């Protein structure tokens, strides 16, 4: 279990500048992020065992996202992940 | 990357978790972007629920309602207990 709460707060203020969040609600948001992190990281671990090299790359994360997320969320998440890696790579 | 989520911290969490021998530079970037996307989708719905409830802050009931009303978020995140 890790804390993402300041970062969750920053995202909240982008999508709703005028809405705050209680400590208990923030606790639930932070739990969601930890749960999804662990599901993607566990799926990524499995996919890496198939590869020539024992590495988790953005390719393993993308596959893990496509397997773990429901299909419509998966599609949008993959678009966001791909765009971030492209911009970082440049 | 154009993200609010912490790539550096997420890199460290992947390394610490011992999920593989090595982690590529792109992996924590892609992962940070997906987790940020997912936080944004939930906070957007939970914020709308808070407005609908005439509140100025998200409380647990608003997250429970936003997740429950969404067929894919319910499948991903499960039931919210309050």
């Amino acid at each position: 279990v890790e804390t993402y709460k300041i970062y969750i707060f920053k995202v909240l203020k982008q999508v709703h500048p005028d809405i705050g969040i209680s400590s208990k609600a923030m606790g639930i948001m932070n739990s969601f992020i930890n749960d999804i992190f662990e599901k993607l990281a566990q799926e990524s671990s499995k996919l890496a065992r198939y590869n020539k090299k024992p590495t988790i790359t953005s390719r393993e994360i993308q596959t893990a996202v496509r397997l773990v997320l429901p299909g419509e969320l998966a599609k949008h998440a993959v678009s966001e992940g791909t765009k971030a890696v492209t911009k970082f790579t440049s | 990357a154009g993200l609010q989520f912490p790539v550096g911290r997420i890199a460290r969490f992947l390394k610490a978790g011992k999920y593989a021998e090595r982690v590529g530079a792109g992996a924590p970037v892609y992962l940070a972007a997906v987790l940020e996307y997912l936080a944004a989708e939930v906070l957007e719905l939970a914020g709308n629920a808070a407005r609908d409830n005439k509140k100025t802050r998200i409380v647990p009931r608003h997250i429970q309602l936003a997740v429950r009303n969404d067929e894919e978020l319910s499948k991903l995140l499960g039931d919210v207990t309050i």
């Binding site: 707060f9 705050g20 969040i21 209680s22 400590s23 208990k24 609600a25 | 802050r57 409380v59």
Partner: peptide, 5 residues
């Protein structure tokens, strides 16, 4: 009760 974050 439930103080703000």
């Amino acid at each position: 009760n439930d103080p703000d974050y």
